[PDB]
Amino acid sequence: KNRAARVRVSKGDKPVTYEEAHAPHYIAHRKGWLSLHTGNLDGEDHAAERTVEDVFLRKFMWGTFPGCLADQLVLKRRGNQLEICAVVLRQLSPHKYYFLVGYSETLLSYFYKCPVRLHLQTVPSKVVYKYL
Amino acid sequence: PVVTISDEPDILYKRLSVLVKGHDKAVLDSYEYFAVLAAKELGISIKVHEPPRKIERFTLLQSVHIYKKHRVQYEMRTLYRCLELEHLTGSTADVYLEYIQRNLPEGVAMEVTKTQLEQLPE
Amino acid sequence: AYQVHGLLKTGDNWKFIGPDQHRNFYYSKFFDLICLMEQIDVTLKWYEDLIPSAYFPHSQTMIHLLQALDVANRLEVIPKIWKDSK
Amino acid sequence: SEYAFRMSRLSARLFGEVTRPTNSKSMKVVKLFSELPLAKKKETYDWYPNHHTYAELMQTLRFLGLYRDEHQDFMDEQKRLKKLRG
Amino acid sequence: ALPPRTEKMAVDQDWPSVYPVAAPFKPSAVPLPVRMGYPVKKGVPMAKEGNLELLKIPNFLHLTPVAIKKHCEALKDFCTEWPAALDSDEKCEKHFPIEIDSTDYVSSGPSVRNPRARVVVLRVKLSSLNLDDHAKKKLIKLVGERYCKTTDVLTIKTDRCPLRRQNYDYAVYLLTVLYHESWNTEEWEKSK
Amino acid sequence: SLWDVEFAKQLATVNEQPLQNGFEELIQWTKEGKLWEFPINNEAGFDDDGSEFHEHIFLEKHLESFPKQGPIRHFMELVTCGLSKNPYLSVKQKVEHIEWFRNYFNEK
Amino acid sequence: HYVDWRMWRDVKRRKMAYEYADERLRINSLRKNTILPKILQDVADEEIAALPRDSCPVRIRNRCVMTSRPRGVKRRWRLSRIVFRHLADHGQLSGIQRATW
Amino acid sequence: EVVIPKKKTWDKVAVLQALASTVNRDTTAVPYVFQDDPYLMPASSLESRSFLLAKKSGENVAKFIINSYPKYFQKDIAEPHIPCLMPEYFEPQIKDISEAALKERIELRKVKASVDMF
Ligand SMILES: [Mg+2]
């Protein structure tokens, strides 16, 4: 059986989000992409280092906003304006939130050498598309 | 509104054609509307064209150790939309081209622009 | 007061507000005065134009924001400004 | 003929390729210097992310407490519970 | 939390002012209950306040037709007009002879080095040369792979020097010294 | 000296105001240089000391003529045309390539 | 701090190939050209065969930028089959669909 | 006759300044420095000042980390070189007793170090 990105059915008590619920055959039929970088089009050079930096961003922001990122991020990349739009929860204090925003806001700018911008989007509870 | 009219006669751009490569036709034709209405109120003559999509399909194995008969196949949809500007001015260039360039979409956006500037022989 | 608010709106002179405390004092005093001698419709127009876009009202203003409404006998606006204050 | 040969010679002198008639086994020289060698390419020498700035900055930022990695938390905890007995 | 600016916002409020720049959705800012996502069997498409699908959409919120119109009021400052060089291609060919291809390949990310952006090719017409009789034969035999016969266009390509402006210089220099060597009569033209 | 540059710093402090808009974010970003120059010329910076077309491909000024009928001088034609058709290397690395062969050719 | 020793072994291979590319390039052309005497090359041969065996561009194995797996790598993203499958199946690599032609 | 016009030359900001003139201020929105999420909007002037000083804390906090470890950020990727984005060196690199070292320590504004080595 195919076991790639398919959360199996439990007993009907398993909260799950649109992203996790959809399987890889819906990857742009129903889901779309979580990272919008241009390198995977027909003619371009640097797609490999874009992905190497992509997995880095996913894991840095995962370990730097500890246990508050509701679902996964949207690493869009237009011009030299990398963007880390988020869906972060409403549990930690806003001064801590603004702090980790600033810390990231400048640290990825000095790691990747371009404008990096985080536009958080606070949400009360981790969303549920269906209970599996 | 700093303008600074400086010195030398124009560069006379003929046929600044923008070829827009993308992963998503809905972003490409929204872009077509944004550029077509901008050229309408810019005064610059635009035309539309659809350079046909190329699919980069390729095959990998599905299981980690064995079973070469069971394979996965992945594909890239690269679509093109050509937006060819004809009979436009050098000043007209780095203001329209600039507006669009800054207001480009994300990973589904490329703006390959060829310029045919005219000139006198020497 | 309107004259130098105009001098402020000339060009980039808004920059010469400077820091946030000076901005809050500037707009607080401007809104106090608008409440003290303007007509209630243009006071509420300045209220929606300035708050919360330009500054955050100080505790005292709240009281004053009301005295103008009480003078104009426009007590129907009390629940919305109460909700805004909360 | 001779005119075709020396007309190609004139065109070669004009455009900048090798003038006198040479064979392919030597024209490999101009093709060489015309391209970069296998090791000098940008992708060839930048194949791997160096892994040191990456992992050592993660080390230092975790030791500053600004990064929580669940993996190192595991190995920390498991190595403690293994040093309890081993 | 807070009751959002969406139901604080009313009609006839300026949307170019609300969204200045391209930015991801921000549904609290957006006064549209836009719903996205394959629905459940006995349910609706998912709501607006938390969707990642409504985030991953490029989002052309910043540029609405009226924003285009008001944007270019200012963007109208920066343009002259063309002369009466006429839409007639033969007229612009008479007026300005040569043609040059000098392009950019814009990418998206940390750098702007696309080396293939130095391609410079030059197309010229001999019927716009006008000073070529038997010296034309010279030019043709000299350029071997160019001059397709159906249309009288010469195309010289330079990709040999790293910069686009000196590539333009190489097109014009090769054109003029090809021209001068074509008008240079040589001692073996008769023994053909 | 330090007094006029310090007056420049303090003038910057007394005219530093909040960004207040996403366009002014890009204003400051260009003003510093983190944002790209738009529209882009794919060759921003990247001057190469004004190579200008005759140092890159005509290496005769650095050729240092030996007796031209020799196979060595043939080599120099071959290597010269290779360095002419090089667009990735600049003129300075072309001339150190020439002097490598010059040094070694003499060394023998 | 490298994924394995073999990856670290290539990062060393990459480095000293990239630094030792000019010297090798010069003597090698001198090899496959037909101008210098048959004996005038025997000497250049020594220099090459004597130039160290970790910079020859014959030992470069395009391995995995994330998890050292030699065979089964796709060059365009420098990823192995199963890692590229993982990322493209979780949906963080743009443009990659499932081929249904 | 060709009325071939002279190109008016612009700077790199004037288009975007005209674009601000296009987008006058939003009377209904908070300043752009704050986020648009209703949980993250400041409610009071004190809260707004607290958020801004927390953001400025995060800023000199990243500056301290990056200047403490410049080796992890020496790899430049953007072209052109952005010297306001490369890390700043505060340690004196000249250890010999010289007037160049005096100029280096004065430029680094190390008062005690400059006095001691003078
Ligand atoms: Mg199967």
CSV table of N, CA, C and O in Angstrom, one decimal, chain E residues 25-69:
chain,number,residue,atom,x,y,z
E,25,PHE,N,-2.2,37.2,1.9
E,25,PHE,CA,-3.6,37.4,2.3
E,25,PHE,C,-4.0,38.3,3.5
E,25,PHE,O,-4.7,39.3,3.3
E,26,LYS,N,-3.7,37.8,4.7
E,26,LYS,CA,-4.2,38.5,5.9
E,26,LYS,C,-5.7,38.7,5.9
E,26,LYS,O,-6.2,39.8,5.7
E,27,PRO,N,-6.4,37.6,6.1
E,27,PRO,CA,-7.9,37.6,6.0
E,27,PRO,C,-8.6,38.5,7.0
E,27,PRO,O,-9.7,38.9,6.8
E,28,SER,N,-7.9,38.8,8.1
E,28,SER,CA,-8.5,39.8,9.0
E,28,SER,C,-8.5,41.2,8.4
E,28,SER,O,-9.5,42.0,8.6
E,29,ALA,N,-7.5,41.5,7.6
E,29,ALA,CA,-7.6,42.8,6.8
E,29,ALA,C,-8.6,42.6,5.7
E,29,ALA,O,-9.3,43.6,5.3
E,30,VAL,N,-8.7,41.4,5.1
E,30,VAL,CA,-9.6,41.3,3.9
E,30,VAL,C,-11.0,41.3,4.3
E,30,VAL,O,-11.5,40.5,5.1
E,31,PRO,N,-11.8,42.2,3.7
E,31,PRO,CA,-13.3,42.3,3.9
E,31,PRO,C,-14.1,41.5,2.9
E,31,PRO,O,-15.0,41.9,2.3
E,32,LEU,N,-13.7,40.2,2.8
E,32,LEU,CA,-14.3,39.3,1.9
E,32,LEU,C,-14.3,37.9,2.6
E,32,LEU,O,-13.2,37.3,2.8
E,33,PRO,N,-15.5,37.3,2.8
E,33,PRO,CA,-15.5,36.0,3.4
E,33,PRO,C,-15.2,34.8,2.5
E,33,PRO,O,-16.0,33.9,2.3
E,34,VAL,N,-14.0,34.9,1.8
E,34,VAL,CA,-13.7,34.1,0.6
E,34,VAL,C,-13.4,32.7,1.2
E,34,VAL,O,-12.7,32.5,2.2
E,35,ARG,N,-14.0,31.6,0.5
E,35,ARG,CA,-13.8,30.2,1.1
E,35,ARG,C,-13.0,29.4,0.1
E,35,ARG,O,-13.4,29.4,-1.1
E,36,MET,N,-12.1,28.6,0.6
E,36,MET,CA,-11.2,27.8,-0.3
E,36,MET,C,-11.1,26.3,0.2
E,36,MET,O,-11.1,26.1,1.4
E,37,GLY,N,-11.0,25.4,-0.8
E,37,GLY,CA,-10.7,24.0,-0.3
E,37,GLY,C,-11.7,22.9,-0.6
E,37,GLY,O,-12.9,23.2,-0.3
E,38,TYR,N,-11.3,21.8,-1.1
E,38,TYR,CA,-12.3,20.7,-1.4
E,38,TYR,C,-13.1,20.5,-0.2
E,38,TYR,O,-12.5,20.2,0.9
E,39,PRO,N,-14.5,20.6,-0.2
E,39,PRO,CA,-15.2,20.5,1.0
E,39,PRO,C,-15.4,19.1,1.5
E,39,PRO,O,-15.0,18.1,0.8
E,40,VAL,N,-15.9,18.9,2.7
E,40,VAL,CA,-16.2,17.6,3.3
E,40,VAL,C,-17.5,17.2,2.7
E,40,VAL,O,-18.2,18.0,2.0
E,41,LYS,N,-17.9,15.9,2.9
E,41,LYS,CA,-19.0,15.3,2.2
E,41,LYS,C,-20.4,16.0,2.5
E,41,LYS,O,-21.1,16.3,1.6
E,42,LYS,N,-20.5,16.4,3.7
E,42,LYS,CA,-21.8,17.0,4.1
E,42,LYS,C,-21.5,18.4,4.7
E,42,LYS,O,-22.1,18.9,5.7
E,43,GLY,N,-20.5,19.1,4.0
E,43,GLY,CA,-20.0,20.4,4.5
E,43,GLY,C,-19.7,21.3,3.4
E,43,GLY,O,-19.8,21.0,2.2
E,44,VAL,N,-19.1,22.4,3.8
E,44,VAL,CA,-18.9,23.6,2.9
E,44,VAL,C,-17.4,23.7,2.7
E,44,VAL,O,-16.6,23.0,3.3
E,45,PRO,N,-16.9,24.4,1.7
E,45,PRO,CA,-15.5,24.8,1.6
E,45,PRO,C,-15.1,25.6,2.9
E,45,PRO,O,-15.9,26.3,3.4
E,46,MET,N,-13.8,25.3,3.3
E,46,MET,CA,-13.3,25.8,4.6
E,46,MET,C,-13.4,27.3,4.7
E,46,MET,O,-13.3,28.0,3.6
E,47,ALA,N,-13.5,27.8,5.9
E,47,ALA,CA,-13.7,29.3,6.1
E,47,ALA,C,-12.4,30.0,5.8
E,47,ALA,O,-11.4,29.5,5.3
E,48,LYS,N,-12.4,31.3,6.1
E,48,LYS,CA,-11.4,32.3,5.7
E,48,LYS,C,-10.3,32.6,6.7
E,48,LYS,O,-9.2,32.8,6.4
E,49,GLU,N,-10.7,32.5,8.0
E,49,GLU,CA,-9.8,33.0,9.1
E,49,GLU,C,-8.6,32.2,9.4
E,49,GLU,O,-7.7,32.7,10.1
E,50,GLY,N,-8.4,31.0,8.8
E,50,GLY,CA,-7.2,30.3,9.1
E,50,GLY,C,-6.6,29.5,7.9
E,50,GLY,O,-5.9,28.5,8.1
E,51,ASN,N,-7.0,29.8,6.7
E,51,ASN,CA,-6.6,28.8,5.6
E,51,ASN,C,-5.2,29.0,5.2
E,51,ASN,O,-4.7,30.1,5.1
E,52,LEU,N,-4.5,27.9,4.9
E,52,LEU,CA,-3.2,28.0,4.3
E,52,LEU,C,-3.3,28.0,2.8
E,52,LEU,O,-2.4,28.4,2.1
E,53,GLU,N,-4.5,27.6,2.3
E,53,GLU,CA,-4.7,27.5,0.8
E,53,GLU,C,-4.9,28.9,0.4
E,53,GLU,O,-4.3,29.3,-0.6
E,54,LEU,N,-5.7,29.7,1.1
E,54,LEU,CA,-5.9,31.1,0.8
E,54,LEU,C,-4.6,31.9,1.1
E,54,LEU,O,-4.5,33.0,0.6
E,55,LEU,N,-3.6,31.3,1.8
E,55,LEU,CA,-2.3,32.0,2.0
E,55,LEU,C,-1.4,31.7,0.7
E,55,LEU,O,-0.9,32.7,0.1
E,56,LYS,N,-1.3,30.4,0.3
E,56,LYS,CA,-0.4,30.0,-0.8
E,56,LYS,C,-0.9,30.6,-2.1
E,56,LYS,O,-0.2,30.4,-3.1
E,57,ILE,N,-2.0,31.3,-2.2
E,57,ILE,CA,-2.5,31.8,-3.5
E,57,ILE,C,-1.7,33.1,-3.7
E,57,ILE,O,-1.7,33.9,-2.7
E,58,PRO,N,-1.0,33.3,-4.8
E,58,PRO,CA,-0.2,34.6,-5.1
E,58,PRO,C,-0.9,35.8,-4.5
E,58,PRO,O,-0.1,36.6,-4.0
E,59,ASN,N,-2.2,36.0,-4.6
E,59,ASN,CA,-2.9,37.1,-3.9
E,59,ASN,C,-2.8,38.4,-4.7
E,59,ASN,O,-1.9,39.2,-4.3
E,60,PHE,N,-3.6,38.6,-5.7
E,60,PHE,CA,-3.5,39.9,-6.4
E,60,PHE,C,-4.5,40.9,-5.8
E,60,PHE,O,-5.2,41.5,-6.6
E,61,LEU,N,-4.5,41.0,-4.5
E,61,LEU,CA,-5.3,41.9,-3.8
E,61,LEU,C,-4.8,43.4,-3.9
E,61,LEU,O,-5.6,44.3,-3.9
E,62,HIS,N,-3.5,43.5,-4.0
E,62,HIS,CA,-2.9,44.8,-4.0
E,62,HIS,C,-3.2,45.6,-5.3
E,62,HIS,O,-3.1,46.8,-5.2
E,63,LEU,N,-3.5,44.9,-6.3
E,63,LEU,CA,-3.7,45.6,-7.6
E,63,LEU,C,-5.1,45.3,-8.2
E,63,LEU,O,-5.2,44.4,-9.0
E,64,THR,N,-5.9,46.3,-8.0
E,64,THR,CA,-7.3,46.2,-8.5
E,64,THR,C,-7.4,47.2,-9.6
E,64,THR,O,-6.5,48.1,-9.7
E,65,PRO,N,-8.3,47.0,-10.6
E,65,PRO,CA,-8.3,47.9,-11.8
E,65,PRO,C,-8.2,49.4,-11.4
E,65,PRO,O,-7.4,50.1,-12.0
E,66,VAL,N,-8.9,49.8,-10.4
E,66,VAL,CA,-8.9,51.2,-9.9
E,66,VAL,C,-7.5,51.6,-9.3
E,66,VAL,O,-7.0,52.7,-9.5
E,67,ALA,N,-6.8,50.6,-8.7
E,67,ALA,CA,-5.5,50.8,-8.3
E,67,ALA,C,-4.5,51.0,-9.5
E,67,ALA,O,-3.6,51.8,-9.4
E,68,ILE,N,-4.8,50.2,-10.5
E,68,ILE,CA,-4.0,50.4,-11.8
E,68,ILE,C,-4.1,51.8,-12.3
E,68,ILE,O,-3.1,52.5,-12.6
E,69,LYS,N,-5.4,52.3,-12.4
E,69,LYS,CA,-5.7,53.6,-12.9
E,69,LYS,C,-5.1,54.7,-12.1
E,69,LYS,O,-4.4,55.6,-12.6
